[PDB]
Design a protein around this nucleic acid. Structure first.
Ligand SMILES: Nc1ncnc2c1ncn2[C@@H]1O[C@H](CSCC[C@H](N)C(=O)O)[C@@H](O)[C@H]1O
Length: 352
DNA sequence: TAAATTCGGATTAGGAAT
DNA sequence: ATTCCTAATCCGAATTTA
């Protein structure tokens, strides 16, 4: 049974001990293409063992993004990239709550000892929870500190719902632009394209932490001095694309597969606003992308150097009350479509 | 009717006690 | 073993707003 590393540093993270410069991959895992697969680390039992079984028995690299920003993000990455001489994109985001939320020291209690936030999700705290916390605290405003039991309730709720102190006895969730920034996207990346505030919350919650992914992908920069062709599966708001952009790795071509219209609009807006000279091709449903469409695209553009994606985690995530049925859930079973498309790419690039 | 809102525990792992 | 705690966690369904 796969056991999560503690600390969850993968093969090493910046500013920490334990950097590992070499691993040995099964020969079946050898590129081309390079691939990069992502999903949540905290799955039902047996999930990552199965995912590794279908990705050539590559052990996952489990990394918590608290080593890259202020918010935790425990993810598993199966990839066949070299792991020596990674570098981080600069400047790295703010590391602590104090620096990431400069105004918050005005409102932050002595007895809230947090210095990191927890994982950014698709559901945030309600206005009613903020009220319940405010009401619980006011009877003690003239006293220097509320009793220990009301303290622990507020702490337990601030952690459960990833709240920050914004006003007098006011603990509120993160705003979309704060999530964007902590996830390493440029400001306003997800505003526009027809995307509602509600949809911004959801797409940000599902996304990559760009600095974590970029640090992994940085080894590609010396390999491809002339840029890469990219097959982006479950593209989302384009975390993998923003990472390559921040790495100054030219994207000659990106074939993107993303079923959300507003997500595809966010990616096209990014493509135009950053003045990408390459070509963006947008597909919608991965289940309707045929093997021979892939093969035709590779014949036209010369194959794919990188296949990157993160299949849905709906049915794996601990926040799902209703349908956390594991890897064969209606959404998460799309992992096997990632595998199907990846095998088509491998068939052309490496043979058999 | 798009958008916003609020509510709803279980699965894991680990540490510390038996 | 068990027992008992703390602890984190890319969420769905239903309803209400505007
Ligand atoms: N059938 C399907 N075909 C293509 N994409 C799908 C799909 N079903 C779900 N998806 C998409 O898969 C994505 C998984 S979330 C991954 C997002 C990405 N890592 C980022 O940087 O944002 C979601 O955006 C979801 O819309």
């Amino acid at each position: 049974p796969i056991r999560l590393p503690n600390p969850m540093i993968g093969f090493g993270v910046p500013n920490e001990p334990g950097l590992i410069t070499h691993r040995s991959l099964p020969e079946l895992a050898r590129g081309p293409p390079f691939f990069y697969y992502e999903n949540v680390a905290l799955t039902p039992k047996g999930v990552w063992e199965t995912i590794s079984r279908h990705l050539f028995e590559i052990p996952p690299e489990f990394v918590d993004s608290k080593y890259f920003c202020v918010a935790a993000r425990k993810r598993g990455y199966i990839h066949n990239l070299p792991i020596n001489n990674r570098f981080q994109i600069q400047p790295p985001p703010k590391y602590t709550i104090h620096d990431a939320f400069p105004l918050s020291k005005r409102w932050w209690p002595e007895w809230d000892k947090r210095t990191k936030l927890n994982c950014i999700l698709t559901r945030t705290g309600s206005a009613q929870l903020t009220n319940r916390i405010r009401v619980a605290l006011e009877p003690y405003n003239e006293e220097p500190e509320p009793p220990k039991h009301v303290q622990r309730y507020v702490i337990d709720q601030c952690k459960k719902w990833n709240l920050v102190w914004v006003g007098k006895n006011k603990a509120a969730p993160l705003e979309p632009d704060e999530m964007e920034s902590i996830l390493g996207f440029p400001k306003n990346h997800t505003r526009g394209g027809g995307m509602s505030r509600t949809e911004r919350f959801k797409s940000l919650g599902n996304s990559f932490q760009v600095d974590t992914v970029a640090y992994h992908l940085s080894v590609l920069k010396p390999i491809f001095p002339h840029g890469i062709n990219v097959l982006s599966l479950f593209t989302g708001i384009g975390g993998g694309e923003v990472a390559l952009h921040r790495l100054q790795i030219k994207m000659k071509l990106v074939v993107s597969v993303e079923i959300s219209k507003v997500n595809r609009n966010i990616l096209k807006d990014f493509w135009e606003q950053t003045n990408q000279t390459g070509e963006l091709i947008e597909f919608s449903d991965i289940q309707h992308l045929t093997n021979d469409t892939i093969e035709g695209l590779m014949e036209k553009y010369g194959g794919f150097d990188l296949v990157i994606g993160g299949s849905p985690c709906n049915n794996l995530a601990g926040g799902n009350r209703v349908s956390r049925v594991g890897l064969e859930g209606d959404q998460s079973s799309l992992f096997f479509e990632y595998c199907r498309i990846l095998e088509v790419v491998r068939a052309r690039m490496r043979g058999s």
